[PDB]
Structure formats: C-alpha cells, structure tokens
Amino acid sequence: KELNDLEKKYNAHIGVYALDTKSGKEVKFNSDKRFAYASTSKAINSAILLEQVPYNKLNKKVHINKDDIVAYSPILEKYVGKDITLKALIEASMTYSDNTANNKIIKEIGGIKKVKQRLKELGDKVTNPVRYEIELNYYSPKSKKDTSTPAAFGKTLNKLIANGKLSKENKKFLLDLMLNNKSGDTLIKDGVPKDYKVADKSGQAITYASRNDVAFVYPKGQSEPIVLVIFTNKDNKSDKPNDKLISETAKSVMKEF
Ligand SMILES: *P(=O)(O)CNC(=O)OCc1ccccc1
C-alpha cells in the first residue's frame, strides 16, 4: 500500500528509510523530516559503548545509587546502592527499555557531549542528542531537541552496527538482544513475512503519539540485513499511536526488497 495512503488511513506522519546493505538500495519517505527518536537511541548508545569495550570486558562494574534512578527503570530500580556489570546494563536497556541503564550508558561513553562528538565522526550532523532520560521524551514539533531524520538515523545504525567497528561477539550480543526483545512484536516484527528475522528497538515519546521502530531485517537466504527506520507521529500533543501503522508501513516497504 502507498505510504501516503497509510498516512491518510491512520491519520499520521510517516518517515521511512530503508537500506539493503547488500545492494546499497534505499527506500525513502519523508526521510529528511525530524522526528523524536525516543528509546530507539538506546540502540545507538549501546553500540557506541560496545566500540570501546570488548566483549570480554563487559563483566566490568558500575555502582548505582538513588541519584541514578529516573522513571521506568524496571531493572535498575532493584540496584540502588548496588553494582551492575556493563553487560547487564545493556540488556536492561535493550530488553526492558530501562531508562536508568540508558543514562549510565551515556555516562560511561562519557556524556551526551561524547555521543554527539562520535555522531559527527560518523558524518551524522543531524541526530540531535540534548537531554537524558526521561526528558528527552518531551517532544515538541518546534524543538530539534532529541530528534533525527529517518535518513540520518538510518545511516548511523548502518555505520555503527551493520558495517561498523564492532567485534564479532559484541555485534552478536547486541543483535541477539534485538531479536529476542519481545516489546517490538506489534511493530516491524508484525509487518514482515514469516520468513524474516527482525532485530528491532522500539520507542515512544511522551507527546504527539511518537511511535518508532528501527530494525535489522534479515530476509531468508540473505545474510546482510535491510536497515529499516520507521518514525511516526500525529498532529495532537495528546494523540495515542496505533501500532498497526508501523506493522503496515513495514509490510509495504518489504515489497521493494
Ligand atoms: P522509550 O521506550 O521510548 C523511553 N520512553 C519512556 O521512558 O517513556 C515514554 C512514555 C511514557 C509514558 C507514555 C508514553 C511514552
């Protein structure tokens, strides 16, 4: 189905960027529009830490205190005044979408400053990390704070994971979390054919029914993933997202590959 027609049908704005890393073939829809990325950056944050810490060192520990906790920290909440390994941080962040794990991660990398630095080095001058969790979820169509374009975000994932500097194991560790993650089930995982493997990281901003899904999609018989970035929003601040919109956009995009 047409992407515009999906916009119409679901009464929403869609931004799509798809790269078959095999062919170099891109699918684009509103790919230069800014959208709040939300928890989808947990993926980006996670990869960056992993370029600086070999798999064998994930056993390293970080001390968590009451000052570390932010809302929606289903895992980290139990670690107050405790230590956690880098490995468990990442798993908390990617699997349960733990906000505190994401924040400690950004810290480990060295701050937003360092994330931002790293992005420019990948040639990403678009992705705009400004706040920590959970504030970064406070989206305004009038602020560029914590937003990116489907195209810049999509090129970043590609340079970071798909064709990056990650070790084999790290790469696999991250990707295994994206595959197993059960939170993205209604998203991209629900729109592609039965055959494909879907490594996703979903997101949801607080405002304007900001519902996202990024993935490394593996068509049966293909070992190279299609990078798929789906950013969505609505016109009203208080609008509720419909997951079906993404499943359906995913399905439409799959057709081109
Ligand atoms: P990620 O899952 O996208 C981080 N988002 C988050 O922690 O909260 C956003 C939120 C809170 C309440 C309702 C809708 C979205």
From Swiss-Prot:
PROSITE patterns (UniProt xref): BETA_LACTAMASE_A, PROKAR_LIPOPROTEIN
Signal as UniProt keyword: yes
Catalytic function, reaction form: a beta-lactam + H2O = a substituted beta-amino acid
Protein EC: 3.5.2.6
Active-site residues, as the UniProt record annotates them: S39 (acyl-ester intermediate)
Keywords carried by this UniProt record: Antibiotic resistance, Hydrolase, Plasmid, Signal, Transposable element
Binding annotation for substrate: K201, S202, G203
Superkingdom of this protein's organism: Bacteria
Pfam families reported for this sequence: Beta-lactamase2, LPAM_1
GO BP: beta-lactam antibiotic catabolic process; response to antibiotic
Any further remark recorded for this protein: The class A beta-lactamase family has a specific amino-acid numbering system, sometimes called Ambler or ABL numbering and often misspelt as Amber. A multiple sequence alignment was used to derive a consensus sequence and then the consensus was numbered taking into account insertions and deletions. This allows use of identical numbers, e.g. for active site residues, despite differences in protein length. UniProt always uses natural numbering of residues, hence there appear to be differences in numbering between this entry and some papers.
Name of protein: Beta-lactamase
Biological source species: Staphylococcus aureus
